[PDB]
Amino acid sequence: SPFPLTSMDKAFITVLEMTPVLGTEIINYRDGMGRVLAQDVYAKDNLPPFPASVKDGYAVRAADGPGDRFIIGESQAGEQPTQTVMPGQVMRVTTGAPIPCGADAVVQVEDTELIRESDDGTEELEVRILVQARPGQDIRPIGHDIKRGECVLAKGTHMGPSEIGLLATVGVTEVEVNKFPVVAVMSTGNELLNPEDDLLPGKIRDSNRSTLLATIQEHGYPTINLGIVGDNPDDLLNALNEGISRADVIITSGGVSMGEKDYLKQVLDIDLHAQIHFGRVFMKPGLPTTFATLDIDGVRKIIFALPGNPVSAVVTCNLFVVPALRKMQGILDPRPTIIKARLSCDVKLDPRPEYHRCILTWHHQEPLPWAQSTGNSRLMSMRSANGLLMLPPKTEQYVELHKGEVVDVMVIGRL
Ligand SMILES: [Ca+2]
Numbered sequence: 001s002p003f004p005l006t007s008m009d010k011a012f013i014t015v016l017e018m019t020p021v022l023g024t025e026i027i028n029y030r031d032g033m034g035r036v037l038a039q040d041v042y043a044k045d046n047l048p049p050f051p052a053s054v055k056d057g058y059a060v061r062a063a064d065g066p067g068d069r070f071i072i073g074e075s076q077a078g079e080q081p082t083q084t085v086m087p088g089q090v091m092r093v094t095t096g097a098p099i100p101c102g103a104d105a106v107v108q109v110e111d112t113e114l115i116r117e118s119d120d121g122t123e124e125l126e127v128r129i130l131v132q133a134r135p136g137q138d139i140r141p142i143g144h145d146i147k148r149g150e151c152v153l154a155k156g157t158h159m160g161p162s163e164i165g166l167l168a169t170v171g172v173t174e175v176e177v178n179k180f181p182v183v184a185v186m187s188t189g190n191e192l193l194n195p196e197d198d199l200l201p202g203k204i205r206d207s208n209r210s211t212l213l214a215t216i217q218e219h220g221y222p223t224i225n226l227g228i229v230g231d232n233p234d235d236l237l238n239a240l241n242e243g244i245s246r247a248d249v250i251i252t253s254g255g256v257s258m259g260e261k262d263y264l265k266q267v268l269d270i271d272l273h274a275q276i277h278f279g280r281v282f283m284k285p286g287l288p289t290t291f292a293t294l295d296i297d298g299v300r301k302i303i304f305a306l307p308g309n310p311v312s313a314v315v316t317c318n319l320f321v322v323p324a325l326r327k328m329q330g331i332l333d334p335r336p337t338i339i340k341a342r343l344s345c346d347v348k349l350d351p352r353p354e355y356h357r358c359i360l361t362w363h364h365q366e367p368l369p370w371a372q373s374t375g376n377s378r379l380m381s382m383r384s385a386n387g388l389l390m391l392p393p394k395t396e397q398y399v400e401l402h403k404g405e406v407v408d409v410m411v412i413g414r415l
Contacts, residue, residue, distance in 0.1 A: 001265060002258060003279025003290070008353050011281045011291070012320065016334065018277060018293050019324040020300045022179040022248065029167040032159045034220045035177040036330030041153040043170045046143035050080070050098040054138040058090040058112060059103035062133040068115065071124050075100050092124060099139055106138035107131060146170065156332050178330030183216045184247035185209055186226035186239050188255035188264060189308060194228065208253040208313045212306075215317055216251075221325055226250075231261040237271045244272075244294065244301050248328060251321060254308030256288040264305055268292050274303060284352040285312035289320065302328075315355050318388055318412050338390070341371035341409040347401050349394040357385035360409060371409050386413030 024038040064087055074092035075081040085091055085102035107129050116125035192206040213223050224247055229239040243250035255264035268274045274292040281289045290305040304321050306313045326334035357374045374385050387409040
C-alpha cells in the first residue's frame with residue numbers, strides 16, 4: 001500500500017482466475033433452477049415408449065387404401081391395446097394413444113366421414129377413410145423423441161425450466177450439481193445505523209448491506225447478513241473470521257479509503273493472512289476495490305472489500321462479484337452478457353473506464369435499445385436499472401460521446 005492501481009481488465013481476469021469452483025452435491029430435480037449439472041444425464045426409457053398417435057382419428061392399414069372400414073374399437077391414451085387390426089378394419093385413436101398391432105398408419109378425423117354409430121350413439125361402427133395414408137403417417141415410433149441410452153443432458157449444462165422438464169421426462173429426479181456459494185455481507189463504518197434505527201447525530205442508515213444482499217439474492221444465491229461492524233481492527237477480524245466460518249464468500253463495504261479509521265486491508269493481510277491480489281482499480285467508480293483469497297484447509301474463500309460509497313458498492317458488486325459467484329456455482333463461462341445500445345445522453349469521458357447504472361428500452365421497430373442513465377420520465381422512474389453502461393476511457397481523439405452513439409451495456413437485470 002498504496003496498492004498499485006490495477007487495470008480494470010487485469011482485475012477482472014484475476015477475480016475469475018483466482019475464484020474456485022465449488023464442490024458438488026445431489027439435489028432433487030425440482031430444485032435445479034439455475035444449477036449446473038456435474039454429471040451427464042441419460043435416458044433409461046424410449047420416448048415415446050410405444051408407437052404413438054400424433055392425431056385424433058383412426059389407426060389403419062395403409063394397404064387397405066381409402067374406403068369403408070369397420071371400427072373394431074378404440075385405443076385410448078394410457079392403455080395398451082389388446083386387439084389387432086385386420087385388413088378392412090381400423091381402430092379409433094386419440095393424440096398420444098398407442099398404435100394397435102396390425103395398423104401401420106394414422107388418418108386424422110378430418111380425412112374421414114363417419115357412416116354408422118350405435119343406437120346409443122356411443123360407438124362408432126364404420127368409417128369412410130377418404131385418403132391413401134402414407135406408411136407410418138401420423139405415428140411417433142418408439143424412441144422417436146428420445147432413445148433409451150441417449151445422453152439427454154451434458155455435464156456443464158446450466159438448468160432452466162425446460163431442462164427440469166426433461167429430467168422429469170426421463171425420470172432422473174436426483175442429479176449431481178455444483179453447490180451454490182453462500183455469501184456473507186457486512187458493512188463497516190462508525191457512522192452507520194441499521195435501516196430500522198432512527199437517526200442519531202453524525203449517523204446515517206446503512207444501505208449497502210441491503211442493496212448488496214438483494215443483488216446476490218436476485219441471482220439465486222443464499223446470503224448471510226453479518227451486520228454493521230465498526231471502524232476498528234479487532235471487531236473487523238472477528239466479523240471476518242465469522243464470515244469465513246459461515247460462508248464461501250465475504251463481501252464488505254466501507255473501510256477501504258487511504259484515510260484513517262481505515263484498517264480493513266491491513267487486517268486482511270496481517271491478521272487474517274489473506275492474499276490481497278489488488279487493492280485499487282483504475283476505474284470509476286470503484287477506485288478502492290479490493291480482492292483477496294484465503295486458503296484454509298484446502299478450501300479457498302474469497303473476499304471482496306468494496307467501497308463505502310453506495311453507488312460504487314452496487315457497481316463493483318455487479319462487475320466483480322456476480323461473475324465470481326457464477327464461476328463458483330459451476331457456470332463454465334461466467335462472464336456477463338454485454339449488449340450494444342444507443343446513448344440517450346451526451347457524456348464526457350473520464351481517463352478511467354467508467355460505469356453507470358441505466359435502463360435499457362427497446363423502441364418500436366428500432367434495432368438497438370436506448371440506454372438511459374439512472375438519476376435524471378416518471379414512467380421510466382418506475383423502472384429498476386437493468387444495465388450498466390460501460391464507458392470507454394478518454395483518449396486524445398475521444399473526449400465525449402454523443403447521444404445516438406453505440407455503447408456497451410452490461411446486463412444486470414431482467415429484459
Ligand atoms: Ca468510512
